Each structure stands twice: as C-alpha cells, then as structure tokens.
Design a protein around this ligand. Structure first.
Ligand SMILES: CCCCc1oc2ccccc2c1C(=O)c1cc(I)c(OCCN(CC)CC)c(I)c1
Ligand SMILES: [Zn+2]
Length: 272
C-alpha cells in the first residue's frame, strides 16, 4: 500500500503525467471564502440587507424577482478580491510541468483561473464568474465585459436585447455545464486521481471517483477519510488527512517543489 511519498515519486518520475484533479471547498476556505453563515462582511451585506433564506441567492425565480443579492456575491467574489493559496499554486505548478490533464472544481471562487491555470484545463462544474450569459437571448459574454457594472452595483444588461446578463454560475435545478461531459474522455485517460478539500459524497462527483481504471492511484487530501473513497477503497488509494493546506505543503516538499512554489507565489502576488 502506497504512501504520500510514493505518489510524489510517481510524479517526480513522470510515471503519472495525465493527472485528473477534483477539488472542493476545503481548498478555498483558507483563502477566506465560505463553503456554499453569521459574522462576515458578506453576510452583513446580503443575509441582512436582503435574502429570505440562504439558497434563494442561487434560485432563478428569486433571481429574476431581485438580482441584487446575487450580484452582491458576484461583486465580493469577482476575480481580484481573494488570493489563491498554496493549494491552487500547487495545481498551477502541476499544469506548468505538463502533468495536469484536467481540474474539476466544485468551487465558484474562480481561484483556479486567478492562479493562472488556463480555462481549457478546467471544468468549473458549478459554473464561473469568468463568463456570463444574457438571460433572454442567450448571448455569451466574457466576465470582464460586465465587471464595471458589477463593481458599480448595476445589474448588467444585454446590449442586443436589454435582458439581464447573468454570470455563468449554476443555479438550483439547472443542468451542469456542457464541459462537464469531458469526464467521459478524461476519467479513462487519467493515470492519477487527486482529490483535494472534499470527499465527493454527492452525485455525480461521487461516481466519478470510481471512473478511473483500477490500477490508478487515488490520493485524498481531506479532513477525513469518508465518502466513496472510504466506502469502496482500492488497493492503490492513499489518504493524507487533517489540514488540507499542511497536506499539500507536505506533498510539495516531497516533490521538491518548495522553493519553486515560493518563487511562483512571490511573482504572482507581485502581479496581483
Ligand atoms: C447535479 C448536481 C448539481 C450540483 C449543484 O448545483 C447547485 C446549485 C446551487 C447551489 C449548489 C449546487 C450544487 C451543489 O453544490 C450541490 C448539489 C446537490 I443535488 C447537493 O446535494 C445535497 C446532497 N444531499 C443528499 C446527500 C444532502 C446529503 C449538494 I450537498 C450540493
Ligand atoms: Zn440578450
């Protein structure tokens, strides 16, 4: 049975070169973002100035009745406000070394892109602020195109039809984005599965943990060994439990990437 050190050695040797990564809230709580709660600036602004129940912010009928609470969230989360942490920059290094096949994220914070991972390596399964769509005519827009409006508290409008333009966040009851169907080709192709800051207990992600081939190691860096990896373990599974930040930092040191990480972060926080 494999250790965290064993997985790092596979990566160093390039024996695993087609890494599929699945990430959740656990990697973004350290940047200061909540899992999608009294006491924060955000909550003082929405959950008090005007939401009726927390979930309404992600419901379409509410949205069309009153888009302001949702846009308060967009303004708080739009790229630039929060910083990627070591977990995101680990995945950035993985990509820059040619080892990342795809990163599947449950998060909407956008920090994978802010860390510099290109859109084509990402599957933002719960959607993104990086793009937006007219709710009436379906015209797509880059997220930059509505940024002035979002930062100024204006509800963005389509210049063709004047419909409300909504960031491409997945709302209750909507289908997952089309890119999610990359799983069909990605999972068979993976030669390593890394799962960070979630246990993927909820479908369709749960089932995806079993879509890699039987010889593929699955590394869970998560608070606990729970979920599908716990219910149906495989002989090449590895669990690094406790703090996901320490976990990643540990893996980065075993990889020998600690100094390169320090240089990346210093360049990157220079530019932001
Ligand atoms: C088909 C999967 C939908 C994914 C999804 O769309 C959302 C829209 C707004 C807010 C959240 C989501 C969201 C999820 O994050 C999500 C979806 C489901 I369905 C979901 O199910 C709850 C699981 N449930 C049964 C075990 C409680 C244990 C959970 I938790 C999160
Ligand atoms: Zn339109």
């Amino acid at each position: 049975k494999l250790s965290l050190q064993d997985v790092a050695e596979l990566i160093r040797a390039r024996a695993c070169q087609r890494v599929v990564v699945m990430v959740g809230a656990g990697i973004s709580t350290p940047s200061g973002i909540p899992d999608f709660s009294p006491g924060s600036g955000l909550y003082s602004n929405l959950q008090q100035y005007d939401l009726p129940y927390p979930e309404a912010i992600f419901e379409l009928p509410f949205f069309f009745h009153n888009p302001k609470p949702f846009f308060t969230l967009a303004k708080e989360l739009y790229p630039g406000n929060y910083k990627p942490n070591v977990t995101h920059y680990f995945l950035r290094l993985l990509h820059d070394k040619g080892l990342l096949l795809r990163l599947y994220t449950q998060n909407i914070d956008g920090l994978e892109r802010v860390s510099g991972i290109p859109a084509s390596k990402l599957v933002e399964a719960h959607g993104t602020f990086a793009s937006a769509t007219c709710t009436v005519c379906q015209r797509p827009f880059p997220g930059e195109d509505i940024r002035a409006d979002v930062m100024a508290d204006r509800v963005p409008r389509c210049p063709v039809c004047t419909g409300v333009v909504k960031p491409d966040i997945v709302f209750f009851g909507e289908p997952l984005p089309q890119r999610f169907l990359l799983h069909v080709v990605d999972f068979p192709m993976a030669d390593l599965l890394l799962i960070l800051g979630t246990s993927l207990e909820v479908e369709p992600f749960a089932s995806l943990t079993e879509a890699v081939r039987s010889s593929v190691p699955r590394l869970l860096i998560n608070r606990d060994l729970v979920g599908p990896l716990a219910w149906h373990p495989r002989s090449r599974d590895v669990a690094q439990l406790g703090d996901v930040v320490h976990g990643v930092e540990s893996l980065v040191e075993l990889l020998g990437w600690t100094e390169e990480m320090r240089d990346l972060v210093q360049r990157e926080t220079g530019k932001l």
